[PDB]
């Protein structure tokens, strides 16, 4: 039989990959933990080897056509190896694309912009331009950073992105995909499981339909923030118009986290930031992550491996070796789990420990599975697991139980609202940003937006869906999208919208399993084994089951739900409407500060 002829190919595959994959994930770790011209080369060699293996492997797995397979697990594994890349394009084309990809990710990383009126020492996005966008209250300066980044990095990236859009589509169509867009939407595509199938288009619709129910809550926050922004930036905000893009707490307005200073409901109540308490308890990065360890043990998951503590880097290495410090978890296989994090005794970092040590628990649970089915159920399942961790490590009950918050300071309705806004500014703020951004690309790939009207339908859309207006007019020399990481780093972005729904869609269930009594915003599940089990029963599967069924194992649904998210922030949606009573709720795309 071919089913068994195949079963034989996967077992030989599993054996040789696990070796070559470990060998490559180690070199990537080695490099990020010690940037050296040497570590680079190794990384490159290790990767060049893995790529060639997967190339041959895919070619071989085409020779086991799916219609003869009856078994599910084997077809998933075969679909994986069969689909994906396939270097369907010529060597000539399949190399330029790499160049474009690298060069695009190169200019962004090496991006340096100087003062258009005072250029002596140009500044880099991190940490200068970002520091200005996070901290400045000076309209003129925030505007200098914003435009400059898009006036230079985005323009030089414009010519490249167009080529990228072309070849990427060729590969997708040659990979049996309408456009490179339809491809990225395949991650959610479920075929073969009856009652749990999912199309590459059902997502766009769900995305849209799920995003409607959200419009009630986002407008009311848009209003509130609009109002507080007029207070801060005095002559620059129309009481009915969109919000200048450069006034949003970061460079793209991706998040509105850094506007709390300017939007707090009650500046009187002391902020939760327990960073000081930690500095007072003199917690060390080891304590922070070990404190994280105790959390999962309480819910019924295991301790970290020792090799985790032996191998992981939880502190800035030093000036002896340069190390990329993006908080990151790693799975190399052969039992090897590690985290790479330059921890800084802070409440954020503290919370980030719990996210990164959520992937490790996820990465572990599903290490019983075969190579190809050692992955999260979809591109959004991993992030959601990490977030639900933070959502309970911040519950004051947790902070008080932990001892970072004295048993005093009982929560008052004022403190709760401060929390739900702090939260909404970040979690809610990004869904429209995210939806808009992707949808722009979805269309760009669909060929629906000509280049001559790229940047037109860009802002046209930021004003319609997001409520954000360009502080300055941009022509077709500009590639503002490209001036965000995920764009010039060729990364599917919708994962953030889906994970946000799943995280609430998940917590409610585990909290219900934890038999939590009050609002979900104060559910610690810091000693709920029952809930740790329910999780482990989705975690342990990896990509073995389709995500629809995985979702059901825990929630009671086969498609993302918004109404759990709406219940979370609902005590702020009611207080937001009351505040926005005498205010205008909604925006006018026509308004422009530059008109």
């Amino acid at each position: 039989t071919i089913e068994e002829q195949a079963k034989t190919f996967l077992d030989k595959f599993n054996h040789e990959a696990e070796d070559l994959f470990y060998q490559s994930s180690l070199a990537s770790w080695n490099y990020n933990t010690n940037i050296t011209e040497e570590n680079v080369q190794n990384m490159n060699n290790a990767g060049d080897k893995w790529s060639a293996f997967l190339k041959e492997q895919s070619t071989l797995a085409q020779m086991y056509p799916l219609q003869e397979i009856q078994n599910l697990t084997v077809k998933l594994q075969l679909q994986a190896l069969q689909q994906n890349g396939s270097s369907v394009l010529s060597e000539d084309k399949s190399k330029r694309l790499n160049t474009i990809l690298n060069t695009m990710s190169t200019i962004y990383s090496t991006g340096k912009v100087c003062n258009p009126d005072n250029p002596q020492e140009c500044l880099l996005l991190e940490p200068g331009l970002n520091e200005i966008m996070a901290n400045s209250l000076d309209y003129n300066e925030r505007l200098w950073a914003w435009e400059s980044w898009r006036s230079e990095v985005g323009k030089q990236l414009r010519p490249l992105y167009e080529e990228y859009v072309v070849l990427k589509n060729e590969m997708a169509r040659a990979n049996h995909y309408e456009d490179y867009g339809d491809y990225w939407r395949g991650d959610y595509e479920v075929n073969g499981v009856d009652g749990y199938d999912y199309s590459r288009g059902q997502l766009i619709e769900d995305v849209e339909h799920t995003f409607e129910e959200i419009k009630p809550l986002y407008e009311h926050l848009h209003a509130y923030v609009r109002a507080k922004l007029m207070n801060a930036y005095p002559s620059y905000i129309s009481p009915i118009g969109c919000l200048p893009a450069h006034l949003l707490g970061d460079m793209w307005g991706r998040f509105w986290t850094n506007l709390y200073s300017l939007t707090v409901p009650f500046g009187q109540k002391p902020n939760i930031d327990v960073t000081d308490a930690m500095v007072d308890q003199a917690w060390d990065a080891q304590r922070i992550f070990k404190e994280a360890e105790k959390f999962f043990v309480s819910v019924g998951l295991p301790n970290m491996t020792q090799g985790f503590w032996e191998n992981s880097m939880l502190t800035d290495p030093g000036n002896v070796q340069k190390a990329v410090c993006h908080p990151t978890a790693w799975d190399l296989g052969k039992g090897d789990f590690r985290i790479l994090m330059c921890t800084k005794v802070t409440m954020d970092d503290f919370l980030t420990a719990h996210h990164e040590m959520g992937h490790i628990q996820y990465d572990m649970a599903y290490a019983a599975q075969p190579f190809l089915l050692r992955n999260g159920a979809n591109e959004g399942f991993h992030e959601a697991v990490g977030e639900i961790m933070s959502l309970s490590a911040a519950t004051p009950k947790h902070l008080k139980s932990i001892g970072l918050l004295s048993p005093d300071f009982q929560e008052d309705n004022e403190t709760e609202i401060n929390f739900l806004l702090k939260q909404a500014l970040t979690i809610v703020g990004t869904l429209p940003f995210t939806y808009m951004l992707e949808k722009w690309r979805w269309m760009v790939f669909k060929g629906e937006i000509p280049k001559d009207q790229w940047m037109k339908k860009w802002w046209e859309m930021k004003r319609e869906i997001v409520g954000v207006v360009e502080p300055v007019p941009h022509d077709e020399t500009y590639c503002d999208p490209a001036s965000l990481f995920h764009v010039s780093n060729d990364y599917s972005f919708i994962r953030y919208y889906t994970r946000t729904l799943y995280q609430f869609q998940f917590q409610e269930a585990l909290c219900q399993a934890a038999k939590h009594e009050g609002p979900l915003h104060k559910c610690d599940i810091s000693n709920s084994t029952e809930a740790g089990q329910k999780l482990f029963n989705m975690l342990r599967l990896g990509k073995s089951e389709p995500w629809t069924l995985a979702l059901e194992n825990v929630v009671g649904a086969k498609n993302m739900n918004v109404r759990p998210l709406l219940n979370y922030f609902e005590p702020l949606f009611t207080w937001l409407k009351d505040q926005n009573k005498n205010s205008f709720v909604g925006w006018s795309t026509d308004w422009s500060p530059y008109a």
Partner: peptide, 17 residues
């Protein structure tokens, strides 16, 4: 592509081969 992930993050492509 990508049939299995090492990091749970999207690091730069320059930090890859």
């Amino acid at each position: 592509a990508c049939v299995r992930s090492f990091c749970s993050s999207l690091l730069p492509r320059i930090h890859c081969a």
